[PDB]
Amino acid sequence: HWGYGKHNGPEHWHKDFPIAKGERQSPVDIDTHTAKYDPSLKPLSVSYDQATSLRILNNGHAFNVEFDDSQDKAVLKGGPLDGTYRLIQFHFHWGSLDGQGSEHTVDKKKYAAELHLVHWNTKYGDFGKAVQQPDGLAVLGIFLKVGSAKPGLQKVVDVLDSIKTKGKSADFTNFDPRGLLPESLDYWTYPGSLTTPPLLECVTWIVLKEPISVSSEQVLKFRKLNFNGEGEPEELMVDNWRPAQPLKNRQIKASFK
Ligand SMILES: [Zn+2]
C-alpha cells in the first residue's frame, strides 16, 4: 500500500487515488511575491485553552496526537473561515536531513518539518462527513526550523520511544498544543487537499508565516521512529512529505502586508 518509498511513494499515489492529479491538491509552493494581501481576511481565532489530548499513535506514516472532538473544546475560527472547526489531531512531516521535510515551501525553501493541526467543520457533524465537503476541514500548518529547542515540544519527543513502530499507541493526556504555536498568527491561505491518501479536496489551508524553532536533538528523535511494525525490518520514518503540487487555478492570499 501507499507510503514514501521508491516503489510506493507520492509519484505512485495517482494509480490508487486518481484525485492526486486533481485541481486543488496540496501542498503547494507559496510564492511570497505573488500572494496578495487581502484586507478582508480576519485574524485567526485559535481557542485551545480547553483542549483535551488523549493519545499518541504511530500510524505507519506519521504519529498523530489525538484530541477529544466530542464537544467544542479546542476550536479554530475566524481567518478565512465561516463557522467553527474542532481540533481532532495534529501530526508532523519531516526529513532525513534538516534541508527538507516540509510539505509546503516558501519561495521554494523547504523547512526541516511541518506541523499540521487538523480541524473539522462542526456543521457536518463528524470528521468522516466533513472530509466529503469542500469546506470540511481547516488545517493550520506551521513550519519548523532547526535552532533553539521548543520547550513545548519536548513532552512529544520524549514519548516517541514508546510508539516506535506502526500500530503502537500510548496515553497522551494533558498536552497543551498552545505550546507549539509561534508568536505571530500572520498567515497565507488557499483551498486544497489532504496531503496523504485519500487526497480529498476538502481543506482550507492556513499556513503560518512565522516558523517555530526546534533543536537538532528534537528532530533527531523524530527520525528514530519506524514506518514498519514491530519485529519487521527497520525502516526509519523519515521523508514522510509530499512534494509541492501544481497551483492550477488558485490564488494564495496573505493576511498581512
Ligand atoms: Zn499532514
The Cβ of residue 243 has, within 10 Å, a number of other Cβ atoms equal to 14
Query: To one decimal place, what's the resolution in Å?
Result: 1.2
Catalytic residue among 1, 61, 104, 119: 61
> Do residues 240 and 64 lie in contact, with contact meaning Cβ atoms separated by under 8 Å?
no
Contacts of 144 (CB under 8 A, 6+ apart): 92, 94, 101, 102, 111, 112, 113, 114, 115, 211, 212, 213, 214, 219
Separation of 141 CA from ligand 1 center, angstroms? Answer: 8
61 is catalytic: yes
Amino acid letter at 214? V
Does 1 count as an annotated binding residue? no
Separation of 204 CA from ligand 1 center, angstroms? Answer: 13
Q: What is the largest CA-CA distance in the chain?
A: 54
The grid coordinates of residue 231 equal: 519485529
The Cβ of residue 117 has, within 10 Å, a number of other Cβ atoms equal to 24
Separation of 254 CA from ligand 1 center, angstroms? Answer: 21
Does 116 count as an annotated binding residue? yes
> Do residues 119 and 141 lie in contact, with contact meaning Cβ atoms separated by under 8 Å?
no
Grid cell 494509480 is found at: 15
Q: How was this structure determined?
A: X-ray
The grid coordinates of residue 161 equal: 520511544
Does 52 count as an annotated binding residue? no
Measure the CA–CA gap between 224 and 227, rounded to whole angstroms: 10
Helices (H) and strands (E) in the chain, counts: 3, 15
Domains of the chain (ranges plus CATH)? 1-257 (3.10.200.10)
Separation of 242 CA from ligand 1 center, angstroms? Answer: 9
